[PDB]
């Protein structure tokens, strides 16, 4: 319910899936990141909980080649490294 402010490059990713504002709830950020993953088919076909994000903007932002969608705490870490103070 509190608002977060994405850094420019995370904001660019969000806007690529139709987001139109500067600040978001965490639930909204997750929804759009999810949309990005699914519409770009970044998940592995055999192990569908694994997202392969090397050579993609998402991998650039998160600083990892891959991650599991089951690892929610690590997902929050990676999102938080891409936020700035809300002014």
Ligand X SMILES: COc1nc(N(C)C)ncc1-n1nc2c(c1C(C)C)[C@H](c1ccc(C#N)cc1)N(c1cc(Cl)c[nH]c1=O)C2=O
We find the least distance from the C-beta atom of residue 66 to ligand X, in angstroms, to be: 11
Q: Is residue 65 close enough to count as binding ligand X by CB under 6 A?
A: no
User: What H or E segment, with its residue span, contains residue 48?
Assistant: none
| Cα separation, 70 vs 54, whole angstroms | 19
Q: Is residue 72 close enough to count as binding ligand X by CB under 6 A?
A: yes
Q: E-assigned strands of 1-87?
A: 5-6, 50-52, 66-68, 83-84
For ligand X, which residue of 2, 20, 48, 87 counts as binding (CB under 6 A)?
A: 48
Which of these ranges, 1-9, 14-22, 67-75, lies near ligand X under the rule CB under 6 A? 67-75
């Amino acid at each position: 319910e509190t608002l977060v402010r994405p850094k420019p490059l995370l904001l660019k990713l969000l806007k690529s899936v139709g987001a139109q504002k500067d600040t978001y709830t965490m639930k909204e950020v997750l929804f759009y990141l999810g949309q990005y993953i699914m519409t770009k088919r970044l998940y592995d076909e055999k192990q569908q909980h694994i997202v392969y994000c090397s050579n993609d903007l998402l991998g650039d932002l998160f600083g990892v080649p891959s991650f599991s969608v089951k690892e929610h705490r690590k997902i929050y870490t990676m999102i938080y490294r891409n936020l700035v103070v809300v002014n």
